[PDB]
Design a protein around this ligand. Structure first.
Ligand code: NI
Length: 341
């Protein structure tokens, strides 16, 4: 059944709650972002109002074929009324079109649901600065002090320099980047840019990217593999067998693959710096795992919460085990006692 942490008290609203059939008493289903664990259950047969960003609405319509009459896009940073309740969508710094949702309850309670987010200090100067938030539905994906990772900017710098060096040493080297969802577009677009190439990809992936309102996108991507030296493939294909196989497909245009796997966290993060990352190599194939995250690090999450000073925190991630729940609730108390709220 729909879990409590997907329900907004004092409303008939749910967040990211599309796989439970009809939720009894739900008058509006919000969708924070177009990732499959969150949209799971939507299709062209859905007949309730779906509230979301413009970008997420483009994907619902074009990829899932949800009918237009049930899609309600809202602009960001704007006070809107939904079934008599004031709401605001904020940028979540996750994947394209991902939002956080502020709910202003009739009784005066204010609730923020982060969806999936990567906390950033820039959020401290959004509309969130303007009033008190009482309850916080928090993306706790990496809520543990072992989770460190570099900035997105540092990771892109590393990837750009690595690709540029490799291809300039060997003009017959191919660059491949793995993907399995939207998000992390900067990795493959930054690399393509430094190499003066477009990124080539399947028709399904190209369709997905054309939904995202990225400026000058027609100048950066293509379905013509042959004219591109940065290829996107399914994450599943980013391994030695899958890459040897793909190289055979290119007809001796290339004699070397340099591949990037943008992982979340991997336990090399507890020891190694970004400057010091190395690839797995077999033959003329090298695979780099790079720690490009679109979720808060532990310290980024902690700063955001200590800034916001909520009265109650409801975790939305890692809630399935007692040990995880109890560990998170410990960190939340530490944060509160350290900051004095
Ligand atoms: Ni997500």
């Amino acid at each position: 059944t729909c879990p409590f942490y997907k329900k907004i008290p004092g409303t008939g609203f749910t967040v990211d709650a599309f796989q439970y059939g009809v939720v009894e008493g739900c008058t509006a289903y919000f969708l924070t972002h177009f990732h499959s664990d969150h949209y799971a259950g939507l299709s062209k047969h859905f007949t309730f109002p779906v509230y979301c960003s413009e970008i997420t609405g483009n994907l619902l319509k074009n990829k899932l074929h949800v009918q237009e009459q049930y899609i309600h896009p809202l602009p960001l940073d704007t006070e809107c009324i939904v079934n008599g309740v004031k709401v605001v969508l904020l940028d979540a710094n996750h994947c394209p079109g991902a939002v956080m949702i502020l709910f202003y309850l009739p009784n005066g309670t204010v609730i923020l649901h982060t969806g999936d987010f990567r906390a950033d200090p820039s959020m401290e100067r959004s509309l969130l600065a303007d009033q008190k938030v009482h309850m916080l539905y928090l993306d706790t994906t990496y809520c543990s002090p072992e989770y460190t990772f570099p900035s997105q900017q540092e990771v892109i710098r590393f990837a750009i320099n690595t690709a540029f060096e490799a291809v300039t040493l060997n003009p017959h080297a191919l660059v491949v980047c793995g993907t399995y969802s939207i998000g992390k577009e900067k990795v493959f677009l930054a690399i393509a840019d430094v190499l003066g190439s477009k990124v080539g990809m399947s028709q399904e992936k190209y369709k997905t990217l054309q939904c995202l309102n990225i400026p000058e996108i027609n100048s950066l991507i293509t379905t013509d593999m042959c004219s591109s030296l940065v290829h996107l493939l399914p994450m599943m294909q980013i391994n030695f067998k899958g890459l040897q196989s793909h190289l055979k497909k290119c007809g001796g245009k290339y004699n070397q693959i340099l591949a990037f796997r943008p992982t979340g966290w991997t336990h090399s993060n507890k020891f190694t710096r970004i400057a010091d990352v190395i690839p797995q190599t077999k033959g003329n194939i090298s695979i780099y795992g790079i720690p490009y995250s679109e979720h808060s690090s532990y310290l980024e999450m902690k700063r955001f919460v200590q800034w916001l000073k909520p009265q109650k925190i409801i975790p939305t991630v890692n809630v399935g085990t007692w040990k995880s729940r109890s560990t998170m609730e410990k960190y939340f108390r530490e944060w509160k006692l350290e900051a004095g709220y």
